[PDB]
Symmetry: D2
Subunit: 137 residues, 4 copies
């Protein structure tokens, strides 16, 4: 028995950036989005400036404990070793709409031992007060 | 009785672009996305390269006839005259995943006469065969 | 005898954009730059978001009359029929730093008759009052 | 006596990027360009996707030793403490067209102690074999 978390929404992948590799990267929003629907569907897609955005992964999802949810992946071109497999995302909600995710993958695409944790940082997409001027739809 | 159309998906706004305004614009994908969920929710959002993407409109939707669907808008910062109102989108599916939409707006935000048809072109976002090299997630 | 025009600078290519192809496109800045140096060198380059920008053309240039200048092109991957050839750009300076250019090309890459005028719109890149916040260098 | 370095060209600012801040950032090209002309002029400018690019700094430059060059800055909106001042850029040329720069700034804009070294990584912009398909000029 756990309280449902606020997973449903549109989430933007972030990354860490620095002009100097000796200075810790600062968090910046990037080009990938995860849609967690109210009806238990998950889709990841990546924008490609100047051309068509692409779906990179899809399946279903449900929260499984207080601090984790499961994605049941049908196909994933970013991480094809997850095709037709479950992946457990351990999550931590931070400030300003940030969600820190980690997930473990046992084997690589060829079935060899991988046993690695992967980390991602996401930020909830929300509606601002006004539609900005000089924005290109 | 009408058959349900394939509205559900993620749709990318397109525009028509030319270097020379005397030469008909070519269709190119842009920075806005419409999520039409399986459970009747609609969200529009616009990416802003270099910074956070923004939700620009949301509500519910349902198909109302063979060639039209309705968005029941809660809030829309792109078109605030549509807040807490319905908008009927007449649609036509074309080739290559393209959907042409048009909709009429009677009044502007202040209640003055507007009586304008607006036209949009959208393209269904799909999964390609492989995750491309030199893509920035 | 003609007065020298203000050609020297960094110029950004613009294009015409519309969400509705029946509405004349509005002028918007795009991804290509032309550097007209003080010492008579010309270089065109095109940015490719997410990856390396590319030089697309280079050579030398000089003004030849009140309303035209000549580019002496060494190599041009955008218009390879101009390799090791001169091209005369007829120019008209507009408002807000806009420069309208046109040029005639007699033959295509294979030597067949082309006899076509091409039109471009450019805008002078200048320094604003302040470095904007939320800009990504 | 030192041999002249290959400073002249168009240079693209790079940064180091990772999804997971524990994994060393990978070098990626960004949105700023430095034009080092054959006639000793320097201009920095930053592209702003969707809108007008901006000049961020300009002046003159000359190589002063085997491993350093000086920028004599007129105005710089990125680093306004450098207005009407010199800045010495220590440089190292690497592989694949990369140039590493570092420079010291003694005081901040108000004249208080800053005494900071700044590090930048730049990549020479070159002409590829063919003009790519699906590129937006």
């Amino acid at each position: 028995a756990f309280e449902p978390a606020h997973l449903q929404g549109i989430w933007q992948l972030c990354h860490y950036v620095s002009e100097n590799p000796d200075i810790p990267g600062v968090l910046k929003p990037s080009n990938t989005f995860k849609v967690l629907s109210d009806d238990g569907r998950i889709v990841n897609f990546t924008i490609r400036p100047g051309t068509d955005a692409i779906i990179t992964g899809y399946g279903t999802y449900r929260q499984i404990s207080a601090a984790a949810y499961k994605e049941s992946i049908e196909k994933n071109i970013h991480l094809p070793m997850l095709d037709n497999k479950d992946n457990i995302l351990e999550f931590e909600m931070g400030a300003g709409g940030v969600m820190y995710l980690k997930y473990f993958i046992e084997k690589d695409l060829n079935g060899n031992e991988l046993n690695t944790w992967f980390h991602e940082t996401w930020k909830r997409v929300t509606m601002p007060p006004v539609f900005p001027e000089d924005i290109v739809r």
